[PDB]
Design a protein around this ligand. Structure first.
Ligand SMILES: [Cu+]
Length: 99
């Protein structure tokens, strides 16, 4: 799945905003509109068997042109809220889940 950061430009959101995956699969986070963006897993709601610092981007690393991307192979069976830290309060939140 390629999670599209910038839902049609007219929705400051992902597409999808909720999805599920299997363990060992890869999520591709890519830009669409409204730049810049990033992906950050929420350190209070991720599963216990990981650290968001291995799956979020670095605090000053962001996707600033249209075609830029970030990628992660993900594991551990649980809920996965990742959001985009500039826009998470503005509503840009996604829910992956390894199931
Ligand atoms: Cu964003």
């Amino acid at each position: 799945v390629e999670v599209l950061l910038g839902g049609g430009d007219g929705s400051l959101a992902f597409l999808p905003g909720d999805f599920s995956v299997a363990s060992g699969e890869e999520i591709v986070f890519k830009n669409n509109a409204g730049f810049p963006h990033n992906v950050v897993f929420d350190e209070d709601e991720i599963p216990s068997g990981v650290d968001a610092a291995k799956i979020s981007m670095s605090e000053e690393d962001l996707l600033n042109a249209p075609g830029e991307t970030y990628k992660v192979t993900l594991t551990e069976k649980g809920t996965y809220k990742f959001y985009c830290s500039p826009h998470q309060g503005a509503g840009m939140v996604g829910k992956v889940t390894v199931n």
